[model samples]
Target: GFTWDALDLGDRGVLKELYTLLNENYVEDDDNMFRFDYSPEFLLWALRPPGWLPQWHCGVRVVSSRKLVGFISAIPANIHIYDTEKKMVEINFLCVHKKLRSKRVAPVLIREITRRVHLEGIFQAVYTAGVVLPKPVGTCRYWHRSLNPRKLIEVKFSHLSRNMTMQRTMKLYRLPETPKTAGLRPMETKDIPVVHQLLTRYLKQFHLTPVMSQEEVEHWFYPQENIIDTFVVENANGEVTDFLSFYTLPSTIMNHPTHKSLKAAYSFYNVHTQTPLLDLMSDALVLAKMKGFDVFNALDLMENKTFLEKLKFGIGDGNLQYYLYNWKCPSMGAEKVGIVLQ
Candidate 1:
């Protein structure tokens, strides 16, 4: 194993190096046309969750140049699996410099992070990857609802289907200027308590879900202008009944003439009690379109399958596999999985 140290978030130089490594080497699409461009602020938000440990942010530096070349992070989370609730870490942002991929850096980084998590007395960890490994607790497919059909086609992110014209495709995916649901508005600080309760109750139906506190709920679901958008529906009794949220994750469009980035909104969490899931998702699509997103992507998890086709979401070629470390269990269907990691 390679020697490593905890990354200091207080150092801008280190943050820039990590950001550059990810922007250059992180996950890309099947065609290599786009790559995730995680901003520094987004990394700070993701790494500094409620009970984050700096030691979990593992990094390796070259002995001679002292350059950061490998990284993996584990953020603390309380996840409920079937009948058991355990405190675990959500492993994410595993990356290695392109030039160093032949050196077996990835396995070492994984092992080092596992060791750090174990040192914290946390045995189980949850992670997701695009490739299939030994086993997955849940396998979910990605579905996309195009918001800007023209831009999507222009960048070759999508193409016109058989017997479909560009104009017809645009018209087919067009949404209303405003949401159809009444009493639906942006989530506010005051709605955190009710939203948390509603989400906790709704997530209990799934076999695997995260157990979050009201403060965590506020940190995650509170509407941040460009980072995240959340909307809640209230009924006549002044009670919050339904809520939907999505986060912004833009990808750098490599070798594109006119477009430099593809703005995408990923589905985060949605709970519908009074409103139908289909109706709630429809509003989400409309709102995403209104926010100028090129596409709104979601995993076929929770109750999302019920509305994906009805809301005109197309199935993506990517499959995201959910894996747990140091723990084994029976496989779960996508419907039974409720956790959405950013």
Candidate 2:
């Protein structure tokens, strides 16, 4: 029999031993190791000095006979699936030692993680896994915009890269990149009415999405703690044009430890009429940098290559990938309405 325990910072030696054990046997499906790879430094960043890992996130390590054999981790809070804010428990880095596969370790790990979440006064969690087994909580459409289209084709991933050729396929689409046309402003509670209107107009175009009530939007996006920040444009007639939302993530690098940087901001969630999108994006970047962030990071859908590669900021492939635990969620309908065409 094996034993499982909540991992602690003082357990680095044990952590390393278990990390190697799971690393050697890690598999998503059909012996694909590419889906999971972590450097020693990444492990340390994920486990040790806990507060840096984001509040409500924890890693559980399973060991058998003093050897690490299995593991599962969960992060508290919400994941934005298109238009809705879902209170999700993100499941990450699940693995079991190869020899222990017959030991039914995966299910045990899942149950343990679930129990922890329940104990924390939360009922549901969102997770993404590489392979679809017998069941999943639900799935969300994955998107990417190739920063380097040519090189991106050469790189391989377990999921779909099937439509890579359509990078330059859009001809009529125009994005405003001028400064005056699109400006930055702090989000205000008074802006909720307009924000709701903008979101409805934007989300109605999608087939799958989570419908966010106004209260949910405020809690997730415009909270008192300012976990979320938005940038938008105002027309000469005083109208909101475009908007983007970003959260500040504490940096894990030792040299700049305790640093909070603006990361995970996404575009296209606001009004962009007549105004230059380039201006909007540029202003957002300047504001982020001025606020002392290392970088303004985002994930652009695979179909939005031109938008992602647009000049003004450096674009690079993000390291994290996602998997869905469930195949259906009422909120998922909000995602499909925003899909662009070639």
Candidate 3:
């Protein structure tokens, strides 16, 4: 029998167990070629928000081996959808050991987190999934901008185009050596208030934007090494007008002998009140390149379409579905959706 338990990340052993469960079994390719190796710090940054609960970090363990085999986490969020605002939880890192897929473990993990969340008076949940369900509020495609094309081809993360020579391909994806935004600087604690105001203003028209408090902004947007990278544009008058950010998510290259990991950056959020969106995104690509990312990925949601093609982000093969539980609204197009789950 498997027993349900809460994970205490304080215990180094507990941290590594959940890390192992995800690194081994979560978000792999059909051929089991690669998997997302979410680091310990990334998990902590995503799962633990202000007022986070230990019980919501749920896991299932083998009664005998006392080994964790199932896991899911629910982090609190306040989402504004159309005219309605609701306090909800964002579901993330839901995974079951490959061997346990048919044992009805997933349904139990869902109900367990549901029970724990409902006990806290939170009934609504927002989430995304690789597979489409009965319906989703919005659906978006993943896109990629090559940063390190040679290594990506080496790892088979991407293929070299048939028409192009290796060096020719490299030249085509070449980026500016430096960011062009003049006033841009790394985000700091002092920039939280303005950043929150700018993001809220930018997301105002989107169907959903998790309403973030100033404290939430600091927790989510405050730069953390290899976990989050954010930059703000301060104009000549010392005013914060625009900002861009991306989070680092590296994958393990299990089958490749030469490469151990492939680093990727996901487009998190960008608010351009003054700088042109294209120019803002262009700077982000340069920053991504300097940081040594293999590929930069983004969803078609929000105004990203405005720059995705101009910035040379080729559409990826996968699609992600955005779902909201215990609440219903008119279905939205990807452009109207503002939620981005890490």
- Which window of 10 residues has the lowest lDDT sum in candidate 2? 333-342
> Model 2 misses residue 224 by how many Å?
6.1
Q: Can you write out model 1's per-residue Cα lDDT over 11-59, one digit (the tens) per residue?
A: 7888888888889789757764667888777787677789898888888
Candidate 2 global CA lDDT score: 0.44
Clash counts for all predictions: 0, 37, 0
Per-residue CA lDDT of candidate 2, range 132-164, in tens? Answer: 544433333323332223322333321223563
- Runs in model 2 deviating more than 4 A are 1-107, 112-179, 206-208, 223-226, 236-240, 255-276, 302-304, 312-320, 328-342
Model 3: residue 339 alpha-carbon error in angstroms: 0.9
Q: How many angstroms is residue 85 displaced in model 3 relative to the true structure, after the best TM-score fit?
A: 0.7
TM-score of each: 0.95, 0.48, 0.96
Query: At residue 292, what lDDT does model 2 achieve?
Result: 44
Q: Candidate 3 residues 92-136, lDDT tens each? A: 888998776466678777888898899988899989988879968
Q: Which 10-residue window of candidate 1 scores lowest in summed lDDT?
A: 1-10
RMSD list, candidates in order? 1.7, 10.0, 1.5
User: What lDDT is reached at residue 75 by model 2?
Assistant: 41
Q: On a 0 to 1 TM-score scale, where does candidate 3 land against the true structure? A: 0.96
The candidate with the higher lDDT, 1 or 2, is 1
